[PDB]
């Protein structure tokens, strides 16, 4: 939104820059004017052939006589015109080069300055300014915004003015050659505008409906895949697949409607374009027959005006480019124009000599820029005598640090003053102040360069001797000398990660080189290991004794030796004095003391589309007829101007131009039939396979087992996305693109056949020229990307040293040496700067060469078109035909290059979609194999089972687990913690086969048993039951598939589950919707519904997994009552966490580390003393506490 003043933006342009811009925009305007002058001559050429074309056919008597005057006229005229063209070529070459080169130059020269000034401005900001801003956004703002600005002040302007120049230059010739046709065109101009609007409105409609349309299927797919274990357990896969297939079925219908309308519209638009232009040209001829206009003039104004007309559209994008740049520049120039209060880049204020270092803090009130929300320091008074060392203590709020924060003048205080020596801190120079003060901070930071350099960031002028004495005086010499490379060893975030204490020591050395009069140590000893703490503490103690010091930490080991200790309460200074005094005071200090003591490319995807033999041949035959229909307009436009040029006696002309102009339209309407067809056939073809793919993918996705669904690689979202995208992407490749390609190769094919069979060696000549300028076009774009990629790599290094500077900034301000990062940033910038100078040089040559080649090509066109060919009996009407045909054929071939990435993307997307289908599981539910035992009564034999979850084959859940439970008795399962209890239920469901061991039910191994039938006998009830959106009767009826469950049956199940109180209470009753779409319920109801769902199946084995887990008060009572009523008639396994409710169980089993530890009935496990007794005794304590 926000822009900047146009003059302010260019403030860094002066002298040569403004000159470059002037000469550049001048040359650009010339370059612009150049083109419409080309079409002006094109009319004159037509007149030359027209004069002769008429006289030649008017004779019908003498032959040789026509070999003299005509050829002479053509000689002089064609020579003149060719000379002119050759003239224009050099012009466009020069002006193009000048334009692009100059503007790119100016751009670079400015952006350099912008960058430097901007970074300086960043470094010059006071910390209070950083506290209120995000540094990441700011660095990214730098790197991105400056680029935006560069895009804005670049050659785009030249293109804009050139475009405006073609616009004016076009309409000027357009008007001056004649007024009528222009006005006649400017009427169909809106008519064209209306059709584009309609087409936009139609695109906006289906976007929204499409999102709504698939979201119907995508919603089903998401609740299913999220419910995967419940649909697997209850084996409703077929149903879910059915639903998904239905939603797809709808989607495809909406899709074919989409296609139909879209195609109709496109066809209509094409028709209106055909009609309008054909109509304009007809009016043209109608004006030529009156002898009011020349046949060539019509062309001149027509082409000049249309050129000028499209110039606007082609111009518009550069506007937005400059407009955004002003906006990007706003927030950029905002920092540069911002003058702070503190500066520190200023040379000002006293730089005192012989500082004795007497500090005082007088009545200081302060708050950080969270402002009024919190005021941390309410008043203050403090003094620290010269040479002394004061230690600040406090419970919380870190009002301690604030003094260190103020003593550097990182902030000015709200009220009060901090005074070093006698003078106010604000009078003395900021830098000098930062220089006379040394600082050691809790988390030390080391910039990435040799250790010497890090010690050199203390002072720019230093020798390795001073470094040595510095580190040795910090006792860091040993540890670093043992390190390889000596002082040349690397440090940083990347590489050579060292001990905190060592880094701290290096920081103390760095600080020590500063030879500061004032030392500030904030929790440097804290947040460090106890062993190295003394090592660093020695250094810290040796860092003093030359200086006055304020220290802050949580370590009261280091405070005792201090001359004065100062406690704070609520920002208020209270206790001050020597240790013994503070201990005699028995205040806060004493209090704290006592307190602290897979690629591929293949067509099997197409072989899937081979389901439809038709719907393709139709589209391609249609699209090839379209491809054959396309050049036919060229052939007409050739002969309309051609016969008119070749007319001879005029009487016959006016009758023919009406026959052509008719036909001219006739190819139009017939185009409506074909274009809609090929669009509809490919469209409908697209929407059906989209059903088959998403159907086969989804289906095979329900085939995969739980082992695959636990994968961190595959989650519900990722699966839905992979499901949607691939199917959506394969449609694009198999869709319109292919049709268009066939249409275009057909187009160029018929075109080149016509052009070739008409022109002899004319076409052969052109086919030599056209590819070269095409390839020359492609090689340019390659260099552009090359220079682009290289430039990105060079500024990345400069942005990397920027990020290092502004991320650690609060450190760099303390050490000063910002000018260092300034210089390094500059030098880092210097290389891209020279690169940007070369860029202009190259961008020009490449551009101009591509302009000149096209213009020079246009010269050889009519020069060979005339002379050798026209001195022969070959004619102008054929030349005009060949050029149209060929060049348009090429411009059709362009769409081939344009459509290239679609297939690649679609192939990468088609790669997965086949693999996902072809993937088979270890356990597939679809196999009709398996025993299907005839005997009802169940048992469960777990024997020597070992299990590790495929996702985490590290910590084994089960090791040699063995259980037995007879029929019609409850198996209670207690455990320390983990899924070891649940893995039983998971394995009995056979979501996994165990690594070793086996499990039987009727005495038959479930592994060789049918999977479905196995799962069909199971009554699974989990913690938080998921209910799909549908009637609660349908949720309950989900308990049994392959058969529809009776109403009285689900009633019985609901009566058994004691949910009937709810179901009869509702207005809809059993038909009520649940699942959050139509209604909301609490846990109790959902669970009882899960119970109903469980026992409507009439399972021989109930499985209750922590059923009461999320639940409270009477809900647990009623649900437990239901569950209790549910069992005792069936085999079941209850892992529930309430042991008081397990107190009645046939067999209790304690599991330990995968091995069954304790076993037997309650009173037995109670008789024994061990884990279970502890399990029951510990959770009784909570009850006793609650009582």
């Amino acid at each position: 939104k926000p822009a900047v003043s146009v003059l302010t933006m260019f403030r860094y342009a002066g002298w040569l820059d403004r000159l470059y811009m002037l000469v550049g925009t001048l040359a650009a305007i010339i370059h612009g004017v150049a083109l419409p002058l080309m079409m002006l001559i094109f009319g004159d050429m037509t007149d030359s052939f027209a004069s002769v074309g008429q006289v030649s056919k008017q004779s019908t008597q003498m032959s040789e006589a026509d070999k003299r005057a005509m050829f002479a006229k053509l000689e002089e005229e064609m020579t003149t015109y060719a000379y002119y063209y050759t003239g224009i070529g050099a012009g466009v070459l020069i002006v193009a080069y000048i334009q692009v080169s100059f503007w790119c130059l100016a751009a670079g020269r400015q952006i350099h300055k912008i960058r430097q000034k901007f970074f300086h401005a960043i470094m010059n900001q006071e910390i209070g300014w950083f506290d209120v801003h995000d540094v990441g956004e700011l660095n990214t703002r730098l790197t991105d915004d400056v680029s935006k600005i560069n895009e804005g002040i670049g050659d785009k302007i030249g293109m804009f003015f050139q475009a405006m120049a073609t616009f004016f230059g076009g309409f000027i010739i357009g008007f001056t050659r004649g007024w009528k046709l222009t006005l006649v065109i400017l009427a169909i101009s809106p008519v064209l505008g209306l059709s584009a609007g309609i087409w936009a409105k139609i695109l906006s409609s289906f976007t929204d409906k499409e999102l709504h349309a698939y979201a119907k299927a995508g919603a089903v797919a998401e609740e299913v895949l999220a419910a995967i274990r419940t649909v697997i357990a209850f084996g409703g896969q077929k149903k879910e697949l059915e639903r998904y297939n239905n939603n797809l079925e709808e989607a495809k219908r909406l899709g074919i409607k989409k296609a139909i309308t879209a195609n109709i519209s496109m066809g209509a638009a094409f028709l209106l374009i055909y009609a309008s232009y054909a109509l304009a040209f007809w009016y043209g001829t109608s004006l030529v027959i009156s002898k009011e206009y020349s046949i060539g003039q019509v062309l001149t104004v027509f082409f000049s005006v249309l050129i000028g007309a499209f110039s606007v559209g082609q111009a518009s994008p550069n506007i937005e480019a400059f407009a955004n740049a002003r906006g990007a520049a706003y927030e950029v120039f905002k920092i540069i124009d911002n003058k702070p209060s503190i500066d520190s880049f200023s040379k000002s204020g006293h730089k005192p000599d012989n500082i004795q270092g007497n500090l005082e803090f007088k009545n200081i009130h302060f708050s950080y820029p969270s402002r009024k929300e919190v005021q941390i320091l309410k008043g203050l008074n403090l003094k620290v005598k010269s040479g002394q060392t004061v230690a600040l203590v406090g419970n919380s709020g870190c009002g301690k640090s604030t003094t260190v924060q103020l003593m550097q003048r990182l902030y000015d205080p709200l009220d009060g003053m901090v005074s070093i020596d006698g003078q106010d801190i604000r009078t003395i120079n900021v830098r000098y102040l930062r220089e006379i003060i040394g600082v050691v901070s809790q988390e030390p930071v080391l910039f990435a360069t040799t250790i010497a350099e890090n010690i050199r960031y203390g002072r720019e002028d230093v020798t390795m001797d001073e470094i040595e004495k510095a580190v040795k005086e910090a006792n860091a010499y040993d540890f670093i000398m043992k390190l390889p490379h000596q002082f040349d060893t690397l440090v940083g975030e990347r590489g050579a990660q060292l001990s905190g204490g060592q880094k701290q020591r290096i920081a103390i050395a760095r600080a020590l080189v500063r030879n500061p009069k004032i030392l500030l140590l904030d929790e440097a000893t804290s947040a460090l290991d106890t062993e190295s703490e003394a090592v660093v503490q020695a250094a810290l103690d040796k860092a003093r004794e030359g200086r006055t010091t304020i220290v802050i930490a949580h370590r009261l080991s280091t405070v005792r030796n201090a001359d004065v200790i100062a406690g704070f309460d609520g920002g208020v200074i209270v206790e001050q004095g020597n240790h013994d005094e503070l201990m005699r005071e028995k205040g806060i200090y004493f209090k704290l003391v006592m307190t602290q003591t897979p690629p591929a490319s293949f067509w099997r995807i197409l072989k899937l589309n081979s389901t439809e033999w038709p719907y393709f041949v139709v589209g391609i035959f249609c699209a090839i007829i379209n491809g054959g229909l396309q050049p036919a307009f060229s052939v007409i436009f050739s002969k309309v101007v051609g016969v008119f040029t070749n007319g001879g006696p005029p009487e016959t002309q006016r009758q023919n131009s009406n026959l052509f102009s008719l036909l001219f339209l006739i190819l139009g309407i017939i185009s409506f039939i074909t274009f809609f067809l090929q669009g509809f056939t490919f469209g409908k073809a697209g929407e059906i396979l989209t059903k088959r793919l998403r159907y086969m993918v989804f289906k095979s996705m329900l085939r995969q087992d739980v082992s695959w669904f636990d994968d961190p690689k595959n989650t519900t979202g990722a699966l839905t996305t992979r499901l949607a995208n691939d199917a959506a992407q394969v449609k694009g490749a198999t869709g319109s693109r292919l049709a268009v390609i066939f249409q275009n190769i057909a187009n160029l094919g018929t075109g080149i056949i016509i052009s070739l069979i008409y022109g002899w060696q004319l076409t052969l000549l052109l086919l030599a020229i056209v590819p070269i300028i095409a390839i020359a076009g492609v090689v340019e774009m390659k260099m552009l990307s090359g220079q682009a990629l290289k430039d990105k790599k060079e500024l990345e290094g400069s942005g990397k040293i920027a990020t290092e500077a502004i991320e650690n900034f609060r450190t760099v301000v303390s050490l000063t040496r910002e000018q260092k990062f300034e210089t390094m940033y500059a030098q880092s910038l210097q290389i891209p700067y020279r690169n940007a100078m070369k860029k202009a040089h190259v961008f020009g040559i490449t551009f101009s060469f591509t302009q000149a080649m096209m213009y020079f090509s246009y010269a050889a066109c009519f020069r060979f078109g005339a002379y050798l060919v026209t001195q022969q009996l070959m004619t102008f009407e054929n030349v005009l035909l060949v050029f149209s045909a060929i060049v348009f054929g090429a411009m059709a071939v362009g769409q081939v290059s344009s459509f290239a990435p679609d297939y690649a993307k679609a192939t990468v997307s088609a790669s997965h979609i086949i693999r996902i289908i072809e993937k088979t599981p270890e356990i597939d539910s679809y196999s009709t194999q398996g025993l299907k035992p005839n005997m009802l009564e169940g048992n469960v034999q777990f024997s020597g089972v070992v299990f590790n979850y495929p996702t985490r084959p590290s910590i084994p859940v089960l090791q040699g687990l063995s259980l037995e439970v007879k029929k019609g008795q409850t198996l209670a399962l207690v455990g320390s913690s983990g899924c070891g209890k649940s893995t039983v239920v998971q394995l009995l469901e056979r979501f996994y086969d165990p690594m070793a061991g086996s499990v039987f039910l009727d005495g038959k191994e479930i592994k060789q048993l049918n999977v479905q039938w196995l799962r069909a006998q199971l009554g699974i009830v989990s913690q938080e039951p998921i209910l799909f959106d549908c009637s609660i009767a349908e949720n309950i009826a989900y308990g049994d598939n392959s058969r529809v469950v009776s109403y009285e049956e689900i009633v019985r199940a609901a009566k058994e589950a004691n949910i009937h109180q709810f179901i009869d209470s509702l207005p809809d009753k059993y038909n009520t919707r649940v699942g959050d779409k139509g209604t909301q319920l609490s846990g109790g109801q959902k669970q009882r519904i899960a119970i109903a769902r469980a026992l409507v199946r009439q399972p021989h084995i109930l499985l209750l997994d922590e059923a009461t887990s999320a639940l409270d008060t009477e809900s647990e009572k009623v649900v437990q009552e239901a569950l209790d009523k549910a069992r005792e008639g069936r085999t079941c396994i209850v892992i529930a966490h309430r042991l008081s409710t397990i107190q009645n169980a046939d067999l209790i089993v304690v599991i330990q580390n995968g091995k069954v530890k304790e076993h037997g009935t309650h009173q037995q496990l109670l008789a024994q003393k061990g884990i279970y007794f502890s399990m029951v005794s510990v959770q009784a304590g909570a009850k006793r506490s609650l009582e």
């Binding site: 232009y277 249309l306 050129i307 050049p631 307009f633 060229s634 436009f637 050029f883 060049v887 348009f888």
Partner: peptide, 6 residues
């Protein structure tokens, strides 16, 4: 070349 065929 503009849009019909030239």
């Amino acid at each position: 070349x503009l849009x019909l065929x030239l």
